[PDB]
């Protein structure tokens, strides 16, 4: 997505992103949401088993 | 409680977290059988 890389399991979700806001953190300072450049629909991202 | 979730211990490298032998349910009985036992019968248990 937009340059960043990663690996994992995409579902939808229904967070509340800021309009200018692309994505989002974790207190691990990781990613776990996304914010498709295509159809602007929150995205969440769970790691592989 | 972990009874719902889907197991999701593990975060996203190499890192999880293994649960104990001994349930809180077994160890709550053991407390129980002892009170009981010390109640009722004294130190000859
Ligand atoms: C970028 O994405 C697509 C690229 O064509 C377009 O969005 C869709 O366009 C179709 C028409 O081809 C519509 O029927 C859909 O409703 C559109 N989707 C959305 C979410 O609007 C459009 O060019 C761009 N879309 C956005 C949201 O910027
Ligand atoms: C493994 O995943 C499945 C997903 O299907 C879980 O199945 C759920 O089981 C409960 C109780 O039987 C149901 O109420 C849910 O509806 C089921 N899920 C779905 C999506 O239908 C199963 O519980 C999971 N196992 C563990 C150990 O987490």
């Not at chain 1, 509340?16 to 989002?24: E, S, V, W």
């Not at chain 2, 409680?1 to 593990?10: F, G, H, K």
Request: charge should be negative.
């Amino acid at each position: 997505f937009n340059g960043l890389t990663g690996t994992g399991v995409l579902t939808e979700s229904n967070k509340k992103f800021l309009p200018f806001q692309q994505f989002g953190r974790d207190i691990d300072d990781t990613t776990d949401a996304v914010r498709d450049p295509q159809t602007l629909e929150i995205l969440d991202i769970t790691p592989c088993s | 409680i972990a009874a719902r979730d889907l197991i999701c211990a593990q975060k996203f490298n190499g890192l999880t977290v293994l649960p104990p032998l001994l349930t809180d349910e077994m160890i709550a009985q053991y407390t129980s059988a002892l009170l009981a036992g010390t109640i009722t019968s004294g130190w000859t248990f």
